[PDB]
Amino acid sequence: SEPLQLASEFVQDLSFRDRNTPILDNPDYYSKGLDYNFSDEVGGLGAFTPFQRQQVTNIPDEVLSQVSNTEIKSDMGIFLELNYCWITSDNKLILWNINNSSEYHCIDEIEHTILKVKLVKPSPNTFVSSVENLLIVATLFDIYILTISFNDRTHELNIFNTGLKVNVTGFNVSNIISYERTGQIFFTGATDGVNVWELQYNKICLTKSNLEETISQLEVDQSRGVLHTLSTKSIVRSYLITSNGLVGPVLIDAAHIRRGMNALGVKNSPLLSNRAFKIAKIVSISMCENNDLFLAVITTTGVRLYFKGSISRRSIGSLKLDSVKFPPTSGPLSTQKASSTYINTTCASTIISPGIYFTCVRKRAEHKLYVSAPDYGILKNYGKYVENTALLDTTDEIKEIVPLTRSFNYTSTPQGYANVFASQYSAEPLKVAVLTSNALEIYCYRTPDEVFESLIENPLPFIHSYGLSEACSTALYLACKFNKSEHIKSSALAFFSAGIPGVVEIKPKSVLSPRFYGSALLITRLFSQIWEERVFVGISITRPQVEYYLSSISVLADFFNIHRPSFVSTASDAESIAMNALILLINSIKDALSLINVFYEDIDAFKSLLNTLMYDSKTREYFFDLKFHDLFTPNAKTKQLIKEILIEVVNANIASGTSADYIVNVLKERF
């Protein structure tokens, strides 16, 4: 009955709903073929284009000039962690900043032909455990380990030799990879078959697979600690990484795959025939994304094969083919079974979590780049799996494809994992780097707001795909959004307030209107990360974060304070009550964040005061377990505690000038 608790309950119900959206992959989603929204032209999907090319950065001349002379071996790649690229020519290695390309560092401490470079995490129990990353360099004779870090002043890259050096003369190292949880480094040699070695550094290398020709790829399941190897004969071997070594392997081969396909009821695909069969790429799947799925296999025909598995303490089960996705054409299974759209697919192809498929196709006429992104909104709105698949701009041969940012997954559980609509505001904007022989190309993911923006003259397909509530939420966002044309803002506001006159109405029925649910969704998603987190530990969130949240909620506060008489003052009155409660909630959140903002002006003094103040035991305990939502909708105890605290911030000389005045204004008004 009380507004703040009511709004709080709404917010929490919606947060629950956001955390429990369908799991990304399920065999039932596409057992009878993949529902594609496909275009073989750049920009062809129009509004629902998942990615757009935003820049092309050439490999700098000053960098290429030091690669000019290369008699034997050249290679290049992207360092996922550093946002740096690298080139090797014979014995020299050059790293260059993706965000600069005037800033480059050479490694000259290397005598012989470089075979492999790799970025890796340090082991937890070492003298270099503090460093962010290690750079492993393997040549014909040695493995060198360097540290890479950032200077805290000139902000340039520091690269230091650790002094670690490992003899690998008869190896010809061909692959390097790490298990990050332990910092273990596994590697292969081109002259040691399918054997897996390990490098330990407290220098020695030891075999793990000694008492299917050679290994072409190593892949680690970081969430489970599983090691997959892909060999030149398209055989996958999986091992459980344990403290006492590798347990396995379990195998996937062409025969296993034929058995699986026949068991799935899908028979005689020309793309999976014994002649046409070869594996381009394998990519592990996190148990956070799917509890059962262990591994995706990309074939040279562009087919995705999904395998489930199971692991115990010292054992690993054989992988079973759970599902298959065929290329798009132009159920549809029967035609997708024989689609040649992705013939042939190269090993530069990859899958970026969650489920985003970058397909590097080489025709026999020419390089084409495709991307397939699951339509998350459709999945959570309808429980239906649809991929938006489009041709991309890149025409040059693709060397590597790597995400430059963290994946925008919403939860760390299969439920709600791919809810990008909930994480669109908090997650880092997804950018994907495509390295070719001439340039680095950056592709940016298009969020719901941009989709709605493309559909500003007619948001009907947005509503159709994503639902009316999401449409109102995004319209509110765009109506408040900074740096937009007046046309876009006024159109978004018009939709939010009136809907589409004569076509779509926004109103409560006898449930509340999608305008209310949209607004509430915005509030819930903005404060998703800090809602259930404790306020005091110092304060659990930094000062720039506090200013961020405060600014955001201030924008919303002003918005609703202005357009209030249109929403407030039986279904209609229920709507009025809910909306009023929500607006009060917004203002309250603003108030709390404002007090925290005041606290952040002299944080050392405030920490001191908190130390001396922190009063029987149950109250200091009640204080240190206060969550942000406890401050957003405070009970009497919280209110009196905060009152006392402010009283001390003023009584003692912490709050300076306008701060303290603002505080006594607060104590006077709402205390």
Termini Cα distance of the chain: 22
Q: 262 Cβ partners below 8 Å, 6+ apart?
A: none
Q: Three-state SS for 164? A: strand
**Residue 653 CB neighbour total at 10 angstroms:** 10
As given in the structure block, the two tokens for residue 446 are 């298009």
Q: Within 13 Å and on the Cβ side, how many CA atoms surround 88?
A: 20
Environment class of 17 (CB within 10 Å of its CB; exposed 0-12, middle 13-18, buried 19+)? middle
Instruction: Give, in order, the Cα–Cα distances in Å from 513 to each of 5, 471, 570, 586.
Output: 20, 12, 13, 18
Q: Three-state SS for 405? A: coil
Q: How far apart are CA 101 and CA 97, in angstroms?
A: 5
Environment class of 359 (CB within 10 Å of its CB; exposed 0-12, middle 13-18, buried 19+)? buried
Environment class of 289 (CB within 10 Å of its CB; exposed 0-12, middle 13-18, buried 19+)? buried
b/e code 73-91 from CB counts within 10 Å (16+ = b): eeebbbbeebbbbbbbbbb
Q: Indicate the length of the chain as a whole number.
A: 671
Residue 444 region, left (φ>0) first, then alpha (ψ -120 to 50), else beta?
Answer: beta
Residue tagged 């692959």 (tokens):
175
Query: Of 270, 274, 268, whose CA–CA distance to 234 is shortest?
Result: 274
As given in the structure block, the two tokens for residue 536 are 């005091």
Angle between helices 514-526 and 3-19 (to 10 degrees): 80
- CA angle, residues 531, 537, 538, in degrees to nearest 5: 105
Environment class of 405 (CB within 10 Å of its CB; exposed 0-12, middle 13-18, buried 19+)? middle
Amino acid at 508: P
CB 277 within 8 A of CB 257: yes
CB 53 within 8 A of CB 79: no
Q: How far apart are CA 541 and CA 530, in angstroms?
A: 8
In the chain, which residues are last before a break of more than 2.5 Å from C to the next N? 202, 211, 330, 365, 510, 537, 569, 614
CB 104 within 8 A of CB 60: yes
Rg of the chain in Å (alpha carbons): 28
Strand 245-252 and strand 279-284: the pairing is unpaired
CB 75 within 8 A of CB 90: no
Resolution (A): 2.4
Residue tagged 């955390």 (tokens):
19
Q: How far apart are CA 273 and CA 329, in angstroms?
A: 19
**Residue 193 CB neighbour total at 10 angstroms:** 14
Q: How far apart are CA 216 and CA 300, in angstroms?
A: 14
Q: What does the H/E/C string look like for 479-537?
A: HHCCCCCHHHHHHHHHHHHHCECCCECCCCCCCCCHHHHHHHHHHHHHCCCCCCCECEC
CB 522 within 8 A of CB 496: no
**Residue 403 CB neighbour total at 10 angstroms:** 21
**Residue 338 CB neighbour total at 10 angstroms:** 14
Q: 2 Cβ partners below 8 Å, 6+ apart?
A: none
As given in the structure block, the two tokens for residue 301 are 């025909």
Strand 245-252 and strand 386-391: the pairing is unpaired
Q: Looking at 204-285, which runs of residues are DSSP E strands?
A: 205-207, 215-221, 226-231, 236-242, 245-252, 279-284
Please list the alpha-helical segments (H only) found in 359-415.
376-382
Dihedral angle sign, alpha carbons of residues 208, 210, 212, 213: positive
CB 251 within 8 A of CB 244: no
**Residue 644 CB neighbour total at 10 angstroms:** 14
Query: Of 447, 443, 442, whose CA–CA distance to 419 is shortest?
Result: 447
Count of H-run helices and E-run strands, the chain: 18, 31
CB 214 within 8 A of CB 235: no
Q: Is-cis flag, bond preceding 332, omega within 30?
A: no
Q: Is-cis flag, bond preceding 354, omega within 30?
A: yes
CB 226 within 8 A of CB 240: yes
Domains of the chain by start residue, with CATH: 1-20+447-671 (1.20.58.1780), 21-446 (no CATH)
Q: Within 13 Å and on the Cβ side, how many CA atoms surround 399?
A: 16
CB 512 within 8 A of CB 506: no
Q: How far apart are CA 586 and CA 409, in angstroms?
A: 26
b/e code 97-133 from CB counts within 10 Å (16+ = b): bbeebeebbebeebeebbbbbbbbbbbeeeebeebeb
CA 145 to chain centre: 29
Q: How far apart are CA 219 and CA 190, in angstroms?
A: 17
CB 578 within 8 A of CB 9: no
